[PDB]
Enzyme design. Sequence first.
Site, mmCIF file in Angstrom:
data_model
loop_
_atom_site.group_PDB
_atom_site.id
_atom_site.type_symbol
_atom_site.label_atom_id
_atom_site.label_comp_id
_atom_site.label_asym_id
_atom_site.label_seq_id
_atom_site.Cartn_x
_atom_site.Cartn_y
_atom_site.Cartn_z
ATOM 1 N N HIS A 82 0.858 -1.184 0.000
ATOM 2 C CA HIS A 82 0.000 0.000 0.000
ATOM 3 C C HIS A 82 0.896 1.237 0.000
ATOM 4 O O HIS A 82 1.363 1.668 1.059
ATOM 5 C CB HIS A 82 -0.953 -0.011 1.202
ATOM 6 N N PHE B 168 0.003 4.342 -0.754
ATOM 7 C CA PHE B 168 -0.696 5.484 -0.166
ATOM 8 C C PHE B 168 -1.178 5.194 1.245
ATOM 9 O O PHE B 168 -0.930 5.992 2.153
ATOM 10 C CB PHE B 168 -1.892 5.899 -1.031
ATOM 11 N N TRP B 169 -1.875 4.068 1.446
ATOM 12 C CA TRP B 169 -2.504 3.825 2.739
ATOM 13 C C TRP B 169 -1.474 3.599 3.848
ATOM 14 O O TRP B 169 -1.785 3.822 5.022
ATOM 15 C CB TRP B 169 -3.494 2.650 2.635
ATOM 16 N N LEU C 31 -16.513 7.539 -3.884
ATOM 17 C CA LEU C 31 -15.213 7.693 -4.526
ATOM 18 C C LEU C 31 -15.229 7.045 -5.908
ATOM 19 O O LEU C 31 -15.524 5.853 -6.041
ATOM 20 C CB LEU C 31 -14.131 7.068 -3.657
ATOM 21 N N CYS C 32 -14.890 7.825 -6.935
ATOM 22 C CA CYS C 32 -15.041 7.396 -8.324
ATOM 23 C C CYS C 32 -14.027 8.109 -9.196
ATOM 24 O O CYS C 32 -13.945 9.335 -9.156
ATOM 25 C CB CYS C 32 -16.444 7.713 -8.850
ATOM 26 N N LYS D 35 -3.978 5.740 -12.110
ATOM 27 C CA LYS D 35 -2.991 6.799 -12.247
ATOM 28 C C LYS D 35 -2.783 7.542 -10.934
ATOM 29 O O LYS D 35 -2.347 8.698 -10.940
ATOM 30 C CB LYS D 35 -3.395 7.742 -13.381
ATOM 31 N N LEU E 289 -4.880 8.837 -9.027
ATOM 32 C CA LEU E 289 -5.743 9.980 -8.794
ATOM 33 C C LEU E 289 -6.570 9.793 -7.532
ATOM 34 O O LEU E 289 -6.884 10.777 -6.855
ATOM 35 C CB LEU E 289 -6.646 10.218 -10.006
ATOM 36 N N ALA E 290 -6.914 8.543 -7.196
ATOM 37 C CA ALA E 290 -7.734 8.284 -6.011
ATOM 38 C C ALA E 290 -7.073 8.760 -4.731
ATOM 39 O O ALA E 290 -7.758 9.416 -3.928
ATOM 40 C CB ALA E 290 -8.089 6.795 -5.907
ATOM 41 N N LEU F 4 -24.060 3.121 3.009
ATOM 42 C CA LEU F 4 -23.938 2.706 1.609
ATOM 43 C C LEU F 4 -22.493 2.328 1.263
ATOM 44 O O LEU F 4 -21.541 2.996 1.679
ATOM 45 C CB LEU F 4 -24.420 3.823 0.682
#
Length: 417
Positions: free
Chosen positions: A8, A10-11, A165-166, A174, A176-177, A417
């Site tokens: 990971h 990023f995380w 998140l989309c 890429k 972007l998330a 959700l």
Amino acid sequence: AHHHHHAHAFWSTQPVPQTEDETEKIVFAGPMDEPKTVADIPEEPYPIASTFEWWTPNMEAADDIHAIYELLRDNYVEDDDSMFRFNYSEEFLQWALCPPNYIPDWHVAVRRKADKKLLAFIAGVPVTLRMGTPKYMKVKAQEKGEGEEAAKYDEPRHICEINFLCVHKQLREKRLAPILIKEATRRVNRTNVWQAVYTAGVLLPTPYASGQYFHRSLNPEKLVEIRFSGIPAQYQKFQNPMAMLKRNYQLPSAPKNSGLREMKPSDVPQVRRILMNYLDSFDVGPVFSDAEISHYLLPRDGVVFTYVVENVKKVTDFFSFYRIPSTVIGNSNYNLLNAAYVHYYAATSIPLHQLILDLLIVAHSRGFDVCNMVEILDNRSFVEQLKFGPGDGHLRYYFYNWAYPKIKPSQVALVML
Ligand SMILES: CCCCCCCCCCCCCC(=O)SCCNC(=O)CCNC(=O)[C@H](O)C(C)(C)COP(=O)(O)OP(=O)(O)OC[C@H]1O[C@@H](n2cnc3c(N)ncnc32)[C@H](O)[C@@H]1OP(=O)(O)O
Ligand SMILES: [Zn+2]
């Protein structure tokens, strides 16, 4: 009779527990990051390529909500090889994204400068959440003399719920998330909010709770014909196996409880009371004002369906379910699957399985084909007698910037959700 079909960079930099081992050793609730103030958070939006701009949609404007609708319709797809596609109508999206006191700035979009095409989205909504130390941990902590540290974060906290998140399919993979998550974090931090709650199907660092999905067949014939369900081999012994299958999931056509009727605005304060009374029993759960009860629970055609038991004067029980229809890919006879998702509820005068039996009856009478839920609240307690079967999905629950012990999904009262 269901059709079962399943490092990971990023995380590892984010203030979340990083391993299952870490989470199972957490004993007190509390923040992960060191204390910050608003002034410590960058004023400027996170940099993105010059062809792109950040954009805050106005959800009251037709073009803006339609733009978000189209992005999610064409790109909010967990599995391209699924025979189904979730559908999020504009009415659904306004209900999920615009509760009372929602913060426009927390609806974060990226769009292309030249043509204003929307390319990415992430959305936060305010929620007030009880998220202090689980009751058992607090108990154990008190026996060791650490009760006041265990209780330090018992006050309900005004936090952020992140969903939708989309990234546009053209922009996938890429990184972007992470940028969307950073920009939402930045904007939420600038509102003096420092925790978020969120759910995902994928496994990330690190859930505090995970629950299996369950399904209750309401239109068995249709579910088999679209291969959501199968008719297993033992039926291939009977005379009219499909008739036998429809007989097995047959429900009464009128609800068993007298006094059951659609929720109306005048019911709101009483529904708030019995709901809050019930939800306060759980370690993690929301706190709703009258305005939030009204927004989230009042009947909203095509979106939310809510019924109360009012056998003379008092509202004593209620249930709610919401609708997400699935497109059915490549079927000659059917194009859509109408799914009812169990929402909030509270029973004080009839057994819970009896209240939810009426939910199934009402949902069926309104044309729903399947009733879905995750095993939070007390949902697990009626699975077998109401003939729910487990699905292949799991809903994983996460906190951002909140150390939290591992708990069971039956300890979670927040429907997400
Ligand atoms: C205090 C306030 C805090 C506010 C924020 C709180 C946290 C909010 C957290 C978000 C809550 C979301 C709740 C929902 O809405 S859950 C629904 C998620 N959305 C969808 O499934 C729609 C379809 N999929 C997509 O649009 C994209 O595939 C997404 C956008 C999901 C990833 O884009 P893409 O495929 O182009 O990838 P990338 O190269 O840009 O980025 C790769 C990185 O992204 C990590 N990734 C992948 N999927 C998810 C996911 N569902 N949650 C969090 N992180 C996720 C992944 O592990 C990797 O990080 P790492 O493994 O390298 O470390
Ligand atoms: Zn299959």
